[PDB]
Write a protein that binds this ligand. Sequence first.
Ligand code: MG
Ligand code: MG
Lengths: 257, 262
Amino acid sequence: GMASMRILLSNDDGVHAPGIQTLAKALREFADVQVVAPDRNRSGASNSLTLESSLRTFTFDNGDIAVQMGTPTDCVYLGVNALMRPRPDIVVSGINAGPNLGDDVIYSGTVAAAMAGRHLGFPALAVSLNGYQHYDTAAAVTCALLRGLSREPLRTGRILNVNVPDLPLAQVKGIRVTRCGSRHPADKVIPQEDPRGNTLYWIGPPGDKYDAGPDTDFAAVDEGYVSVTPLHVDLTAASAHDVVSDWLDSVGVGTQW
Amino acid sequence: HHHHHGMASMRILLSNDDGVHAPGIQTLAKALREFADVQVVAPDRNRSGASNSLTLESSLRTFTFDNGDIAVQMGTPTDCVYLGVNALMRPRPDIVVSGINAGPNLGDDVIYSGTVAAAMAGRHLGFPALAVSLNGYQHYDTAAAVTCALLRGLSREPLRTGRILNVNVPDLPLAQVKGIRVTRCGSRHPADKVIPQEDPRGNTLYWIGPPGDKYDAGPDTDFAAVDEGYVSVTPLHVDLTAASAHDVVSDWLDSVGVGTQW
Ligand SMILES: [Mg+2]
Ligand SMILES: [Mg+2]
């Protein structure tokens, strides 16, 4: 090999989490790896960033950096811009304890860290295990995608959201290029009272699967395939443009007549 | 004949990410209260940059003020709307309005926006959710006026397609606002600045820098519209799929023998 791959590895479960550590070990067999991860579990962090306060880092013995109270996007931000010199080739996020599928991915901090590395030399990898058993399987899948990214460049798509079925590698049927599924709106809130009679509120479970069709990420994983979905950060709903414009004319907003 | 038909014709969950004490939400609450049934459910402090984050491993505590505003303690903007819609409000809201935010929410910044995230949690409602941000800190009244027009608009006719509208208002007196444009999100160069700062014990702490330079500010972007003095309205969705990359990724995989044997 003419060049080593330099990987900024991050996650969302925290620097000590089994996921990030199993993958770290796997990647280190053939790549330079720098972990920059949250100091504790930050699931549900989405693409949040720390703007109101400065961030404190702690470096471990194996060279791992943890950002205290830092979101996954903080980590990737500091890794790319300040802490890795030169900047990394690519960001790998994961392996996450649990799936990031369908319309849940906008809340995923795992995905968020991958999206913060979208402007690097290789497309970012978000890697989630559909469970907690086979981190080894997901590490193998990642190492394969990294191998694949260096045999031939991926020309389009700055983010690959990867979901790995929780099976031993031998039982994974393969890989499907998929689109994000969708859910019926979530509406469950679990209230619990405190000792003083005050009502406190837990955010309940996701909504029921709604678009879990054959071409979706929900289906692929259910059928034992690694789901790969190219993602972007553009949130424009382009198909709604005309309807919105016509509506405005229709109700006289922005126009005199 | 009055400017609005009815004093409390729609139920509005009003939120933000600047917090309940922010002048932007407060100015807007006043304005909306002329014609709407308004319930504020917002964070207890400034949560700018909170994106679509939520509190999952902890239950949430709410605090109610004398005027009836609810602040969710520790709560994210998504937390607030999620709680407001699903638990706190009787009767349920017809629409979520989020803002007015201090500062723009434009381009690829929208995914990092707590203002936008709050609207997005109201996307399943009767009316499309509105995210409203001011391009500055001066003319909250203008943004308020624009929001009231959009809302009177919804009373005259429903918006069919489009679940969330991201609205950016030029920081100008209303008379100087050239009008409105339906835009697409522009984009920026990644931010690259990291401002270091030493603590009293002499340890180096880091600040996230400002956003990157504009990259894509074409004629029909949200960036252009605002720069040119127009209110920008971009319809958004929560879906992150990059559909126009499907075939390239599939060919690529096949080409590199990942997922197949040969
Ligand atoms: Mg996690
Ligand atoms: Mg704000």
